[PDB]
Amino acid sequence: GSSGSSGPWQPPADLSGLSIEEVSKSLRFIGLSEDVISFFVTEKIDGNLLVQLTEEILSEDFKLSKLQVKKIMQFINGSGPSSG
């Protein structure tokens, strides 16, 4: 494809290295709220940080919704045999 809008970007296999900026797009994959994304970039949250974050820290500190914490966790781990 010459010119125009093409070339879809996506997150790598491992989330241990991404930058605070890459994270903003990392969540875009699943499609989260505009507030959630910025909530990470504003908290200096990066790739190495995301992987470090846990459901407990996401519900204790972040205190995000039950759905969010569930969506973010699924992104970190990656495993998902349920296949919604």
CATH number at residue 59: 1.10.150.50
Q: Measure CA of the first residue to CA of the last residue in the chain; give whole Å.
A: 33
Domain count, the chain: 1
Number of neighbours of residue 49 by Cβ within 10 angstroms: 16
CB-based contact 34:27 (threshold 8 Å): no
CB-based contact 47:23 (threshold 8 Å): yes
d(CA 42, CA 60) in angstroms, rounded, equals 18
- Determination technique for this entry: NMR
**DSSP letter string over 9-65?**
----S--SS--HHHHHHHGGGT---HHHHHHHHTTT--HHHHHH--HHHHHHTS---
The answer to whether position 64 is within a domain reads yes
Nearest to 41 by CA among 29, 25, 30, 53: 25
The answer to whether position 30 is within a domain reads yes
